[PDB]
Amino acid sequence: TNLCPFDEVFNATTFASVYAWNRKRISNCVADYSVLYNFAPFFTFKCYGVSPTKLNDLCFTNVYADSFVIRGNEVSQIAPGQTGNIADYNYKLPDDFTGCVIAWNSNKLDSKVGGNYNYRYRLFRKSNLKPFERDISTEIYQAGNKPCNGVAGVNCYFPLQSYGFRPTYGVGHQPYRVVVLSFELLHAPATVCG
Amino acid sequence: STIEEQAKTFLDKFNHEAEDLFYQSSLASWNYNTNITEENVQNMNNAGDKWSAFLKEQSTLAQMYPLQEIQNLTVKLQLQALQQNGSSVLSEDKSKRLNTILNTMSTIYSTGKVCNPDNPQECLLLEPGLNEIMANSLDYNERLWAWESWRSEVGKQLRPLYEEYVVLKNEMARANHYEDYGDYWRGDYEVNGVDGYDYSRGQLIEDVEHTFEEIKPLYEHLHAYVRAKLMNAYPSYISPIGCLPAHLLGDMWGRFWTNLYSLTVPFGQKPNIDVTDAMVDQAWDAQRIFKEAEKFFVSVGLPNMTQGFWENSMLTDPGNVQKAVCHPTAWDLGKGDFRILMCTKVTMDDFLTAHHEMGHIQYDMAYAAQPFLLRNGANEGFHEAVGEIMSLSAATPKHLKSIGLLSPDFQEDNETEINFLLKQALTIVGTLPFTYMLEKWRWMVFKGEIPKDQWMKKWWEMKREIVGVVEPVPHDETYCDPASLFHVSNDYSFIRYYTRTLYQFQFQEALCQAAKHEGPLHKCDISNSTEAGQKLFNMLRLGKSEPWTLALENVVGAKNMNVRPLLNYFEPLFTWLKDQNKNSFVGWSTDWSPYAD
Ligand SMILES: *[C@@H]1O[C@H](CO)[C@@H](O[C@@H]2O[C@H](CO)[C@@H](O[C@@H]3O[C@H](CO)[C@@H](O)[C@H](O)[C@@H]3O)[C@H](O)[C@H]2NC(C)=O)[C@H](O)[C@H]1NC(C)=O
Ligand SMILES: *[C@@H]1O[C@H](CO)[C@@H](O[C@@H]2O[C@H](CO)[C@@H](O[C@@H]3O[C@H](CO)[C@@H](O)[C@H](O)[C@@H]3O)[C@H](O)[C@H]2NC(C)=O)[C@H](O)[C@H]1NC(C)=O
Ligand SMILES: *[C@@H]1O[C@H](CO)[C@@H](O[C@@H]2O[C@H](CO)[C@@H](O)[C@H](O)[C@H]2NC(C)=O)[C@H](O)[C@H]1NC(C)=O
Ligand SMILES: *[C@@H]1O[C@H](CO)[C@@H](O[C@@H]2O[C@H](CO)[C@@H](O)[C@H](O)[C@H]2NC(C)=O)[C@H](O)[C@H]1NC(C)=O
Numbered sequence: 013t014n015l016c017p018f019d020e021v022f023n024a025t026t027f028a029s030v031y032a033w034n035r036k037r038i039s040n041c042v043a044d045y046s047v048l049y050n051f052a053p054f055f056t057f058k059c060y061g062v063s064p065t066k067l068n069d070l071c072f073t074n075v076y077a078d079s080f081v082i083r084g085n086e087v088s089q090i091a092p093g094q095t096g097n098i099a100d101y102n103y104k105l106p107d108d109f110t111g112c113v114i115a116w117n118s119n120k121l122d123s124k125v126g127g128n129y130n131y132r133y134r135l136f137r138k139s140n141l142k143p144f145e146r147d148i149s150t151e152i153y154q155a156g157n158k159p160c161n162g163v164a165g166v167n168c169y170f171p172l173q174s175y176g177f178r179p180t181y182g183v184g185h186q187p188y189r190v191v192v193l194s195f196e197l198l199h200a201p202a203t204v205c206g
Numbered sequence: 207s208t209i210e211e212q213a214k215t216f217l218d219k220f221n222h223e224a225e226d227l228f229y230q231s232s233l234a235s236w237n238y239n240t241n242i243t244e245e246n247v248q249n250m251n252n253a254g255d256k257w258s259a260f261l262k263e264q265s266t267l268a269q270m271y272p273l274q275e276i277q278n279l280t281v282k283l284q285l286q287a288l289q290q291n292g293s294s295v296l297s298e299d300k301s302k303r304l305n306t307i308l309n310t311m312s313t314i315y316s317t318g319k320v321c322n323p324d325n326p327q328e329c330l331l332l333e334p335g336l337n338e339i340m341a342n343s344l345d346y347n348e349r350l351w352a353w354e355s356w357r358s359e360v361g362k363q364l365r366p367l368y369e370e371y372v373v374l375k376n377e378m379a380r381a382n383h384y385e386d387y388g389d390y391w392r393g394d395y396e397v398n399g400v401d402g403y404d405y406s407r408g409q410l411i412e413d414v415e416h417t418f419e420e421i422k423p424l425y426e427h428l429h430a431y432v433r434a435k436l437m438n439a440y441p442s443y444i445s446p447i448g449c450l451p452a453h454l455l456g457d458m459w460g461r462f463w464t465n466l467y468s469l470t471v472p473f474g475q476k477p478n479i480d481v482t483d484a485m486v487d488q489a490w491d492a493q494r495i496f497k498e499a500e501k502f503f504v505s506v507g508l509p510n511m512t513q514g515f516w517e518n519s520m521l522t523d524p525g526n527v528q529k530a531v532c533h534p535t536a537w538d539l540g541k542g543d544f545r546i547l548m549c550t551k552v553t554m555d556d557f558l559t560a561h562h563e564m565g566h567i568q569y570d571m572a573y574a575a576q577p578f579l580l581r582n583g584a585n586e587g588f589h590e591a592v593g594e595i596m597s598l599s600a601a602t603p604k605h606l607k608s609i610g611l612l613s614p615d616f617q618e619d620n621e622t623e624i625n626f627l628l629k630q631a632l633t634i635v636g637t638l639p640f641t642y643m644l645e646k647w648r649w650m651v652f653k654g655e656i657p658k659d660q661w662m663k664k665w666w667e668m669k670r671e672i673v674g675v676v677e678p679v680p681h682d683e684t685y686c687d688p689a690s691l692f693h694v695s696n697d698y699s700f701i702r703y704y705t706r707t708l709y710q711f712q713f714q715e716a717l718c719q720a721a722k723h724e725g726p727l728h729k730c731d732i733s734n735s736t737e738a739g740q741k742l743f744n745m746l747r748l749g750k751s752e753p754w755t756l757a758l759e760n761v762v763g764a765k766n767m768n769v770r771p772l773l774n775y776f777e778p779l780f781t782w783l784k785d786q787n788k789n790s791f792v793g794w795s796t797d798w799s800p801y802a803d
């Protein structure tokens with residue numbers, strides 16, 4: 013009868029960069045998505061599978077909560093089927109998605125005056141990521157056919173580029189902390205109620 | 207695997223690295239331009255230096271993808287831009303010499319001073335001393351002294367430097383497969399490999415001359431009229447058939463005839479329009495000026511300024527503690543950050559300049575979605591033209607009345623509009639033969655058509671023949687009067703102003719047609735006309751991703767530069783000048799001079 017991470021995920025310290033999004037098993041516990049939906053500063057609160065506060069009345073087997081950070085033009089991609097830069101090279105939403113996408117600004121903390129490069133994306137990858145896959149591998153990209161044995165240079169680049177986050181950015185280029193609540197429910201014991 | 211795919215990936219790496227580094231440089235440059243301190247002089251320099259080095263490294267890297275095996279036109283554009291090495295095609299020795307000469311000439315112009323013949327410790331710079339003389343003084347001898355001493359004290363220093371500059375820049379341009387440095391400059395208007403829109407580097411020459419031929423009547427009548435008025439002001443100096451003396455033209459060079467307005471206003475008693483008093487009477491501050499500019503641009507469908515624009519722009523003189531560079535400028539730092547730097551005064555001049563600079567900002571926000579390398583105007587003449595048509599619309603009485611500054615009981619007549627059109631022609635038409643001739647003299651010197659021993663001799667012939675201006679003192683070849691202007695001794699192509707003048711009136715006419723404007727063109731305001739705004743955004747959103755000819759056709763439906771909108775804007779004053787000159791000689795003889803008696 014314990015409550016679900018409430019503040020552990022949303023009201024956290026720092027979010028993971030998007031290429032290495034951490035996923036937390038949100039299970040065996042009653043969730044407070046009833047009254048957290050009403051906080052409402054979020055700049056994109058859209059659940060692509062079920063009703064917002066109605067979902068209390070339906071336990072789920074194993075809610076997965078993935079948390080990372082992007083920008084406003086990147087937010088348009090944390091979506092089922094949308095393949096911009098971020099939903100096919102790091103964190104792709106399955107076409108059969110059923111969960112939530114919560115997005116709020118973050119300038120006040122995730123952007124520092126001088127290039128907070130902690131938060132990164134993948135921009136180069138041999139293949140497009142598969143639904144709900146994490147790639148963190150820092151293998152050099154083999155763009156040129158030539159052998160690039162850990163080499164950083166011509167037609168071979170570090171596959172991780174950092175958002176040069178700064179306060180004075182456009183609202184679209186600004187930081188957004190973003191959490192995706194993959195609601196799953198199947199024969200496995202459903203222990204996420206409300 | 208292919209060459210174009212690897213080039214696409216190279217440019218993909220480049221754009222992100224470039225956004226970050228260029229934002230660094232722009233922010234340090236802002237830092238400096240708003241908060242003057244030796245410290246962020248050092249920061250501006252170090253940031254711009256890392257940016258310069260990144261560009262040279264990426265240009266060497268870009269020359270490793272040949273354009274010959276690349277088909278995507280837009281990719282080819284970006285790579286050709288990154289591949290223009292420039293002065294790094296010379297030897298390092300010759301590049302250091304060229305840069306040494308450029309810096310020496312620049313600091314000679316900026317630090318060239320003349321001292322009066324009675325006090326060897328009291329001197330004037332060009333700005334502000336001699337400029338204030340040439341812009342305000344009515345005494346003939348004071349003006350003559352200023353003109354001649356600026357061209358002998360500082361021009362004589364610039365002669366040999368300019369000769370070596372010609373040699374090195376011709377080497378630089380021939381080394382990048384242009385016939386000379388002027389052809390290099392004309393390379394800005396070049397369009398290749400798009401059927402129905404191409405444009406060659408000599409075609410610019412031909413169109414400039416062909417359109418100037420059509421301008422010649424309007425200019426001849428303006429010249430004869432200004433001569434009549436000045437000759438009324440200086441009877442014992444100006445001949446009624448001769449050229450105008452160079453040092454009585456309003457500024458140091460006769461670049462603009464605007465300061466002759468006091469001496470040539472047709473109806474010198476009719477009240478001139480200036481809403482400054484009204485802005486002050488209705489408690490307007492700079493906040494209100496820029497809010498009205500934003501309101502104008504919104505009235506036609508464009509977006510309002512970003513919250514960053516209001517949080518970050520410097521729109522007032524920031525007191526006396528910190529000094530700032532108050533030249534009105536529009537800044538696109540990239541990555542969604544747009545600012546304006548202007549020490550705004552509650553005046554009408556600053557009111558119009560605000561709409562001009564916010565037009566720059568609107569252009570920047572339109573093509574913001576383009577790649578880093580294509581975030582610019584169609585050619586060198588598009589930004590300033592866009593900025594000018596905003597002042598054109600917001601200056602009209604219809605707009606001033608619309609926003610509450612001008613009272614509805616203001617009487618537009620056939621005299622006050624002639625005063626207005628005459629000031630406009632003194633600024634706009636007046637600079638056109640000057641610009642054409644200056645860039646033509648440069649183009650010939652670069653092509654090798656004027657021997658050194660005739661440089662100045664040709665210059666003042668061209669002054670007499672094309673512009674209608676005679677020099678008041680004979681100059682042998684110890685002078686370099688071209689270099690005595692800011693733009694010749696600091697390496698900037700000049701034809702951009704000619705082309706900009708023509709572009710801005712093509713724009714204003716097309717927009718006023720889309721806005722269903724009745725009456726003469728100069729009276730037109732494009733406010734509350736979303737269709738004109740859409741027709742303009744269709745070209746603003748392009749940046750330089752399509753040929754400049756295609757961007758122009760998007761607004762005006764025509765693929766080439768054209769003078770007819772200029773002549774249509776100025777046709778009322780044209781006919782008025784034709785009438786006023788019925789008792790005057792129109793044209794000029796080239797052999798009369800104030801020194802040949
Ligand atoms: C124009 O640039 C100067 C140069 O920095 C700015 O002076 C700074 O003013 C702030 C307060 O406005 C102060 O910050 C101080 O910084 C030092 C060093 O980090 C720190 O030890 C102090 O505790 C304090 O935070 C300081 O006077 C100065 N900062 C410096 C020297 O780095 C000035 O503020 C700028 N003008 C504008 C428009 O803000
Ligand atoms: C020349 O190279 C460019 C660069 O790739 C090519 O333009 C690209 O075209 C693709 C496919 O049409 C675009 O992807 C699209 O993305 C949008 C998202 O806005 C999506 O709605 C579409 O479903 C599609 O997936 C890509 O944006 C575009 N690259 C840009 C605009 O920079 C181009 O096709 C090549 N050839 C020519 C003739 O342009
Ligand atoms: C910036 O533009 C927005 C978007 O058009 C403006 O929002 C409109 O504002 C007017 C008056 O305030 C309303 O009547 C409209 O219904 C609004 N439309 C939309 C789509 O928001 C906004 O006014 C502008 N910014 C400011 C500060 O006024
Ligand atoms: C552009 O449209 C606005 C809105 O209709 C006009 O401004 C209004 O003019 C009326 C009548 O003079 C007045 O009530 C107000 O001063 C304005 N606001 C509103 C809400 O009506 C404006 O005049 C139009 N542009 C021009 C050039 O006429």
Ligand SMILES: *[C@@H]1O[C@H](CO)[C@@H](O)[C@H](O)[C@H]1NC(C)=O
Nearest residue numbers: 619620621622624781782785
């Ligand atoms: C302007 O209007 C007045 C009104 O009487 C008229 O006399 C004058 O002729 C008009 N303009 C010109 C250029 O004559």
